[PDB]
Symmetry: C2
Subunit: 264 residues, 2 copies
């Protein structure tokens, strides 16, 4: 934090961030899925609240803001490795981890901007216990309704709904490994194996551990895909404070990713 | 790091095992309790913060009352800041631009992940102070949180006094007396600290306003010493929740002790 204020010239505010967003190409009425590192921007007056307000100010309620709200800590620990936990714990975990409830369950590894966004009034969250998304604005409901349990990031997911809307991806101080949309590419290309997974959900007031099938999503190759992707020169670079940012069309990178995976 | 935390845990902490530790320590149905916590101190928990919030609710129940501080010192006048400070050219820009306190939105600072989870629960209500708010759930949640004064934020018009009147309890989960907000009421009652001009952004008659008011220069760095001397009386129940060293005490007990302690100088 001292290091954060030391590397900032002037405070970042809703105003300067709004300014930065516009200069990068974000504009009123866009559909945008946002991925962020708060700290990467520099010191901000109002922290995560400023970033969220700045985004809503640029996009407005006539546009749509989306952010991933994953909650991987609800998953079956059979498959954990960062870190793993003892096998003797696994059935205890399956019988005791609390059910997902959209209005309550914290995200994991999404960031403070997402934790703040998902709590705002009028923000709605899809119902997936592991791979949910939150959305605000014109298409918030359409984007978040009826996510499939199996194939969570596939053709019935919010990622597909953003695709159909010809939306944008905004990366703030993070790389392609945070670019959730490329999972749609994985799905389309068959680039991962299916695995037996589980997660806790509420079925009419009762907690149930639900078993389902999903792709073993792996962001391994996303960074390499982004490098090759940016050689076609359709990604806007720009800064929000100290942060290196990227604005791109979601269909561009999803279509590119699908072909990339197919070539292997 | 999750790696560490896992290492130091023999079996998972769960809603069930936390409920059990809480009851052993002395938490029970219908109790009024203010809670201060470190999540990591407990060891590995299946469900993390949610599990702790749910366990507290399961023990206390709606017929009892859970309170947590939800301070947001990020919103204070930067003239007073030191962990960390910011350049003085920043100060007026901050005053002019920091977003207003909104109880449903404004995040806490330094309160912990259990408080961030708790404050978002559906029937949790939060008091109206831009710097020194509290959140509460259960029987006395409304009475405890309403009508907190802007000036003297942690004094006789605050949730701390309301807890005192309810003869409530304070639970520390892996933390010490420096986290024990209730002791600020002691500072107030004893006149322990000087009155300073403070500020904060609020929504007032329609719009964001930077509001100036007076408050005590609260200082929780004295509380660890008060705590050591208080515990010589043997009225604190000590026990574990997972790996965490915990303490349960009557709020009146420590608030009274602290008032007398400051007055002795
Ligand atoms: S599919 C996968 C998709 N993933 C995503 O969308 C997530 C993308 N984000 C990332 O990957 C990021 O690297 C993250 C979120 C995982 C981590 O980035 P960080 O900036 O370290 O975390 P985050 O965005 O939560 O911000 C919190 C940080 O902001 C900093 N911070 C706190 N207050 C302020 C402020 N007023 N101004 C600026 N920075 C601040 C703190 O350094 C730090 O939190 P900490 O106190 O817990 O260390
Ligand atoms: S008046 C002021 C009164 N203040 C209070 O009431 C605050 C009391 N609390 C404190 O002072 C504490 O020392 C704190 C909150 C400042 C810091 O304690 P921490 O345990 O480090 O933080 P917190 O309680 O937020 O828990 C988060 C941590 O839990 C750990 N954690 C995450 N998931 C889990 C899990 N499932 N099980 C166990 N630990 C976990 C992580 O180590 C760490 O979070 P990070 O990823 O952000 O580093
Ligand atoms: Cl009580
Ligand atoms: Cl007195
Ligand atoms: Cl401890
Ligand atoms: Mg419930």
């Amino acid at each position: 934090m001292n290091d954060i204020v030391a590397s900032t010239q002037l405070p970042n505010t809703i105003k300067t961030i709004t300014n930065d967003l516009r200069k990068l190409g974000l504009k009123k009425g866009m559909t945008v899925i946002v991925h962020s590192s708060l700290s990467s921007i520099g010191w901000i007056s109002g922290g995560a609240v400023a970033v969220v307000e700045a985004l809503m100010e640029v996009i407005t309620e006539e546009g749509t803001i989306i952010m991933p709200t994953q909650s991987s800590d609800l998953s079956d620990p059979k498959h954990w490795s960062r870190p793993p936990v003892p096998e003797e714990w696994w059935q205890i975990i399956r019988d005791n981890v609390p059910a997902f409830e959209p209005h309550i369950t914290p995200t994991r590894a999404m960031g403070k901007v997402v934790e703040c966004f998902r709590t705002y009034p009028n923000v709605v969250r899809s119902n997936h216990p592991l791979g949910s998304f939150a959305a605000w604005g014109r298409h918030a409901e359409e984007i978040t309704v009826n996510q499939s349990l199996s194939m969570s990031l596939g053709e019935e997911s919010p990622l597909r709904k953003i695709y159909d809307l010809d939306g944008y991806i905004l990366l703030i101080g993070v790389g392609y490994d945070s670019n959730t949309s490329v999972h749609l590419s994985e799905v389309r290309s068959g680039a991962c194996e299916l695995i037996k997974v589980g997660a806790p959900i509420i079925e009419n007031g009762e907690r149930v551990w639900k078993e389902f099938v999903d792709m073993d999503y792996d962001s391994d190759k996303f960074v390499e895909i982004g490098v090759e992707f940016e050689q076609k020169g359709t990604v806007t670079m720009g800064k929000i404070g100290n942060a290196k940012c990227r604005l791109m069309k979601q269909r561009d990178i999803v279509d590119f990713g699908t072909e990339w995976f197919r070539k292997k």
